[PDB]
Amino acid sequence: EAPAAVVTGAAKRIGRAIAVKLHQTGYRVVIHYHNSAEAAVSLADELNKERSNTAVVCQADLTNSNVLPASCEEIINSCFRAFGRCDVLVNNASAFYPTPLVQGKTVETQVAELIGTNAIAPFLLTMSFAQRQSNLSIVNLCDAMVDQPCMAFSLYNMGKHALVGLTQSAALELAPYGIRVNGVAPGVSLLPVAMGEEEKDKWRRKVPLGRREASAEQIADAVIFLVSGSAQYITGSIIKVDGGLSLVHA
Amino acid sequence: EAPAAVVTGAAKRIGRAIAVKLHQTGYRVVIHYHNSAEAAVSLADELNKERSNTAVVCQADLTNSNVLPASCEEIINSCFRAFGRCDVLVNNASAFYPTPLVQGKTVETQVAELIGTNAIAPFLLTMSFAQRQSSNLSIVNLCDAMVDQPCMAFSLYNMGKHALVGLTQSAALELAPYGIRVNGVAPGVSLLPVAMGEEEKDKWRRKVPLGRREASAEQIADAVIFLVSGSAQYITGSIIKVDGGLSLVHA
Amino acid sequence: EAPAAVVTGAAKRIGRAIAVKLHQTGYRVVIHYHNSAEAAVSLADELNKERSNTAVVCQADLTNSNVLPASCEEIINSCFRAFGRCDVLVNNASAFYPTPLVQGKTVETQVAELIGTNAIAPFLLTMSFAQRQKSSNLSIVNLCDAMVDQPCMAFSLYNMGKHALVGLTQSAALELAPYGIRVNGVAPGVSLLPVAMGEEEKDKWRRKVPLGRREASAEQIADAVIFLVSGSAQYITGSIIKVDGGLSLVHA
Amino acid sequence: EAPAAVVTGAAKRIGRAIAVKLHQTGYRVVIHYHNSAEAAVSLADELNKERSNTAVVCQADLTNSNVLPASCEEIINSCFRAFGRCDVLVNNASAFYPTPLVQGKTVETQVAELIGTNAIAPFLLTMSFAQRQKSNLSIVNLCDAMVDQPCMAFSLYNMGKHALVGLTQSAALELAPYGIRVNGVAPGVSLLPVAMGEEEKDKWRRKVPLGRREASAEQIADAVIFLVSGSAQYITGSIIKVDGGLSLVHA
Ligand SMILES: NC(=O)c1ccc[n+]([C@@H]2O[C@H](COP(=O)([O-])OP(=O)(O)OC[C@H]3O[C@@H](n4cnc5c(N)ncnc54)[C@H](OP(=O)(O)O)[C@@H]3O)[C@@H](O)[C@H]2O)c1
Ligand SMILES: NC(=O)c1ccc[n+]([C@@H]2O[C@H](COP(=O)([O-])OP(=O)(O)OC[C@H]3O[C@@H](n4cnc5c(N)ncnc54)[C@H](OP(=O)(O)O)[C@@H]3O)[C@@H](O)[C@H]2O)c1
Ligand SMILES: NC(=O)c1ccc[n+]([C@@H]2O[C@H](COP(=O)([O-])OP(=O)(O)OC[C@H]3O[C@@H](n4cnc5c(N)ncnc54)[C@H](OP(=O)(O)O)[C@@H]3O)[C@@H](O)[C@H]2O)c1
Ligand SMILES: NC(=O)c1ccc[n+]([C@@H]2O[C@H](COP(=O)([O-])OP(=O)(O)OC[C@H]3O[C@@H](n4cnc5c(N)ncnc54)[C@H](OP(=O)(O)O)[C@@H]3O)[C@@H](O)[C@H]2O)c1
Ligand SMILES: Nc1nc2ccc(SCc3ccc(Cl)c(Cl)c3)cc2s1
Ligand SMILES: Nc1nc2ccc(SCc3ccc(Cl)c(Cl)c3)cc2s1
Ligand SMILES: Nc1nc2ccc(SCc3ccc(Cl)c(Cl)c3)cc2s1
Ligand SMILES: Nc1nc2ccc(SCc3ccc(Cl)c(Cl)c3)cc2s1
Interface of D with B in 100-159 (CB under 8 A): 100-103, 107-108, 111, 115, 119-120, 123-124, 126-127, 130-131, 147-148, 150, 152-156, 158-159
Identify the helix (H) or strand (E) that includes residue D185.
Answer: strand D181-187
**Phi and psi for B121 in degrees, rounded to 5?**
-60, -45
How many angstroms from the chain centroid is the CA of residue B229?
Answer: 17
Of all atoms in ligand 8, which is nearest to the CA of residue D196? 16
Q: How far apart are CA C43 and CA C40, in angstroms?
A: 5
Strand partners, C29: C5, C55
Q: What is the DSSP letter of D86?
A: -
Question: Residues, chain A, total?
Answer: 250
Count of CA atoms in the C-beta half-sphere (13 A) of D167: 28
Q: How far apart are CA A234 and CA C131, in angstroms?
A: 45
| CA neighbor of A89 nearest in space, from A103, A102, A72, A106 | A72
Helix (H, G, I), strand (E, B) or coil at D190: coil
Is the Cα dihedral D151, D152, D157, D161 positive or negative?
A: positive
**Phi and psi for D75 in degrees, rounded to 5?**
-60, -45
Identify the helix (H) or strand (E) that includes residue A32.
Answer: strand A28-33
Instruction: For residue C100, count other CB atoms closer than 10 A to its CB.
Output: 12
Instruction: For residue D20, count other CB atoms closer than 10 A to its CB.
Output: 20
Residue B94 is assigned to a ligand binding site:
yes
Q: Tell me the helix, strand and coil percentages in chain A, rounded to 5.
A: 50, 15, 40
Are residues A40 and A55 in contact, defined by beta-carbon separation less than 8 angstroms?
no
Are residues B193 and B154 in contact, defined by beta-carbon separation less than 8 angstroms?
no
Q: How far apart are CA B248 and CA B105, in angstroms?
A: 35
Is beta strand A55-59 parallel, antiparallel or unpaired with respect to C181-188? unpaired
CATH assignment at residue B56: 3.40.50.720
- Chain D, nearest residue to B169 by Cα: D148
Angle at D18 between CA D116 and CA C26, to 5 degrees: 140
| CA neighbor of D5 nearest in space, from D74, D55, D73, D59 | D55
Q: What is the DSSP letter of A149?
A: P
User: In sequence order, which residues have a C-beta less than 8 Å from that of residue A250 and are 6 or more positions away?
Assistant: D149, D207, D246, D249, D250, D251
Are residues A207 and B135 in contact, defined by beta-carbon separation less than 8 angstroms?
no
Helix (H, G, I), strand (E, B) or coil at A74: helix
D211 ligand 8 Cβ < 6 A: no
Strand partners, D141: D91, D184
Are residues B158 and B212 in contact, defined by beta-carbon separation less than 8 angstroms?
no
Are residues C164 and A119 in contact, defined by beta-carbon separation less than 8 angstroms?
yes
Strand partners, C33: C59
Distance C158 CA to ligand 7 centre (A): 10
User: In sequence order, which residues have a C-beta less than 8 Å from that of residue D16 and are 6 or more positions away?
Assistant: D10, D31, D39, D43, D217
Q: How far apart are CA A46 and CA A36, in angstroms?
A: 16
Strands of the A179-186 sheet, one edge to the other: A55-59, A28-33, A4-7, A88-91, A136-141, A179-186, A238-241
Kindly report the protein residue whose alpha carbon is nearest to atom 11 of ligand 6: B151
User: What does the DSSP assignment read for C149-187?
Assistant: TSPPTT-HHHHHHHHHHHHHHHHHHHHHGGGTEEEEEEE
Q: How far apart are CA C6 and CA C56, in angstroms?
A: 10
B94 ligand 2 Cβ < 6 A: yes
Helices (H) and strands (E) in chain D, counts: 8, 7
Q: How far apart are CA A106 and CA A7, in angstroms?
A: 29
- Chain A, nearest residue to B222 by Cα: A230
Burial class (CB in 10 A: 0-12, 13-18, 19+), B194: exposed
User: In sequence order, which residues have a C-beta less than 8 Å from that of residue B175 and are 6 or more positions away?
Assistant: B126, B130, B139, B181, B182, D101, D102
Of all atoms in ligand 1, which is nearest to the CA of residue A193? 19
Identify the helix (H) or strand (E) that includes residue C237.
Answer: none
Q: How far apart are CA B119 and CA B63, in angstroms?
A: 10
Give the Å distances, CA to CA, from A22 to A43, A59, A214, C231, C243.
13, 20, 18, 55, 45
Identify the helix (H) or strand (E) that includes residue A155.
Answer: helix A154-174
Helix (H, G, I), strand (E, B) or coil at D104: coil
**Phi and psi for A58 in degrees, rounded to 5?**
-145, 120
Strand partners, B241: B186
Are residues D210 and C172 in contact, defined by beta-carbon separation less than 8 angstroms?
no
Of all atoms in ligand 1, which is nearest to the CA of residue A35? 41
Whether B167 sits inside 8 A of D152 (CB atoms) is: no
Amino acid at the residue A15: G
Helix (H, G, I), strand (E, B) or coil at A126: helix
User: What does the DSSP assignment read for D142-182?
Assistant: E--TTTTSPPTT-HHHHHHHHHHHHHHHHHHHHHGGGT-EE
Q: What is the DSSP letter of A169?
A: H
Q: How far apart are CA D233 and CA C246, in angstroms?
A: 12
User: What does the DSSP assignment read for C75-111?
Assistant: HHHHHHHHHS---EEEE---------S-----HHHHH
- Domain with D173 in it: 1-251
- b vs e for C199-226, b when ≥16 Cβ sit within 10 Å of the residue's Cβ? eeeeeebbebbbbbeebbebbbbbbbbb
| CA neighbor of C143 nearest in space, from C195, C221, C73 | C221
Q: How far apart are CA B74 and CA B66, in angstroms?
A: 14
| CA neighbor of A148 nearest in space, from A248, A14, A25 | A248
Helix (H, G, I), strand (E, B) or coil at A166: helix
Instruction: For residue A190, count other CB atoms closer than 10 A to its CB.
Output: 16
Amino acid at the residue C204: K
Whether C227 sits inside 8 A of D225 (CB atoms) is: no
How many angstroms from the chain centroid is the CA of residue A229?
Answer: 20
Q: What is the DSSP letter of A120?
A: I
Q: How far apart are CA D92 and CA D161, in angstroms?
A: 11
Count of domains for chain D: 1
Identify the helix (H) or strand (E) that includes residue A8.
Answer: none
User: What does the DSSP assignment read for C127-151?
Assistant: HHHHHTT----EEEEEE--TTTTSP
Q: What is the DSSP letter of C196?
A: T
Pick left, alpha or beta for residue D202 (phi over 0 → left; psi -120 to 50 → alpha; otherwise beta).
Answer: alpha
Angle between helix A68-83 and A121-132 (nearest 10)? 40
Identify the helix (H) or strand (E) that includes residue A130.
Answer: helix A121-132
Count of CA atoms in the C-beta half-sphere (13 A) of A19: 33
Distance A118 CA to ligand 1 centre (A): 9
Give the Å distances, CA to CA, from D246 to B31, D4, D223.
44, 33, 17
Query: Which residue among A119, A151, A165 sits closest to C148, beta carbon to beta carbon?
Result: A165
Are residues C115 and A134 in contact, defined by beta-carbon separation less than 8 angstroms?
no
Is beta strand A88-91 parallel, antiparallel or unpaired with respect to A136-141? parallel
Burial class (CB in 10 A: 0-12, 13-18, 19+), A219: buried
**Phi and psi for B61 in degrees, rounded to 5?**
-80, 130
Q: How far apart are CA C4 and CA C44, in angstroms?
A: 14
Residue to substitute in C14, C57, C220 for testing ligand 3 pocket (most ligand atoms within 8 angstroms of CB): C14
The separation between the first and the last C-alpha atoms of chain C, rounded to the nearest angstrom, is 51
Q: How far apart are CA A16 and CA A29, in angstroms?
A: 11
**Phi and psi for B161 in degrees, rounded to 5?**
-70, -35
Q: What is the resolution of the experimental data for this entry, in Å?
A: 1.5
Q: How far apart are CA A95 and CA A103, in angstroms?
A: 21
Question: Residues, chain B, total?
Answer: 251
Whether B171 sits inside 8 A of D159 (CB atoms) is: no
Residue B118 is assigned to a ligand binding site:
no
Amino acid at the residue C103: Q
Q: What is the DSSP letter of D196?
A: S
Distance C103 CA to ligand 7 centre (A): 22
Tell me which method was used to determine the 3D structure: X-ray
User: What does the DSSP assignment read for C21-73?
Assistant: HHHHHT-EEEEEESS-HHHHHHHHHHHHHHSTT-EEEEE---S-STTHHHHHH
Amino acid at the residue B135: S
Q: How far apart are CA D64 and CA B112, in angstroms?
A: 10
| CA neighbor of D140 nearest in space, from D80, D229, D40, D31 | D229
Q: What is the DSSP letter of A52?
A: T
User: What does the DSSP assignment read for chain B?
Assistant: ---EEEETT-SSHHHHHHHHHHHHHT-EEEEEESS-HHHHHHHHHHHHHHSTT-EEEEE---S-STTHHHHHHHHHHHHHHHHS---EEEE---------S-----HHHHHHHHHIIIIIHHHHHHHHHHHT-----EEEEE--TTTTSPPTT-HHHHHHHHHHHHHHHHHHHHHGGGT-EEEEEEESS-SPPTTS-HHHHHHHHTT-TTTSSPPPHHHHHHHHHHHHSGGGTT--S-EEEESTTGGG---
Angle at C34 between CA C32 and CA C36, to 5 degrees: 95
Q: How far apart are CA A18 and CA A21, in angstroms?
A: 5
Is D210's Cβ below 8 Å from some Cβ in A?
no
**Phi and psi for D249 in degrees, rounded to 5?**
-85, 120
| CA neighbor of B22 nearest in space, from B33, B12, B13, B31 | B31
Q: How far apart are CA B143 and CA A90, in angstroms?
A: 28
Is beta strand D88-91 parallel, antiparallel or unpaired with respect to D4-7? parallel
**Residues of chain B positioned with their CB less than 8 A from the CB of D165:** 162
Angle at C234 between CA C232 and CA C240, to 5 degrees: 90
Q: How far apart are CA B188 and CA C251, in angstroms?
A: 11
User: In sequence order, which residues have a C-beta less than 8 Å from that of residue C42 and are 6 or more positions away?
Assistant: none
Are residues A20 and A48 in contact, defined by beta-carbon separation less than 8 angstroms?
no
Are residues C128 and C8 in contact, defined by beta-carbon separation less than 8 angstroms?
no
How many angstroms from the chain centroid is the CA of residue C57?
Answer: 16
Kindly report the protein residue whose alpha carbon is nearest to atom 46 of ligand 4: D94
User: In sequence order, which residues have a C-beta less than 8 Å from that of residue C81 and are 6 or more positions away?
Assistant: none
**Residues of chain B positioned with their CB less than 8 A from the CB of C189:** none
Are residues D183 and D171 in contact, defined by beta-carbon separation less than 8 angstroms?
no
The separation between the first and the last C-alpha atoms of chain D, rounded to the nearest angstrom, is 51
Q: Is D144 a catalytic residue?
A: yes
Helix (H, G, I), strand (E, B) or coil at C233: helix
User: What does the DSSP assignment read for D207-250?
Assistant: T-TTTSSPPPHHHHHHHHHHHHSGGGTT--S-EEEESTTGGG--
Angle at B54 between CA B50 and CA B57, to 5 degrees: 110
Residue to substitute in A191, A219, A240 for testing ligand 5 pocket (most ligand atoms within 8 angstroms of CB): A191
Q: How far apart are CA C5 and CA B250, in angstroms?
A: 34
Whether B167 sits inside 8 A of D160 (CB atoms) is: no
Strand partners, D140: D90, D183
Q: How far apart are CA A18 and CA A30, in angstroms?
A: 11
User: In sequence order, which residues have a C-beta less than 8 Å from that of residue B153 and are 6 or more positions away?
Assistant: B98, B99, B100, B101, D174
User: What does the DSSP assignment read for A182-240?
Assistant: EEEEESS-SPPTTS-HHHHHHHHTT-TTTSSPPPHHHHHHHHHHHHSGGGTT--S-EEE
Q: How far apart are CA D72 and CA C122, in angstroms?
A: 47
Q: What is the DSSP letter of A114?
A: H
| CA neighbor of C169 nearest in space, from C134, C136, C133, C144 | C144
Is D86's Cβ below 8 Å from some Cβ in B?
no
| CA neighbor of D19 nearest in space, from D55, D71, D58 | D55
Angle between helix B121-131 and B68-83 (nearest 10)? 40
- b vs e for B81-91, b when ≥16 Cβ sit within 10 Å of the residue's Cβ? ebbebbbbbbb
Q: How far apart are CA D68 and CA D41, in angstroms?
A: 23
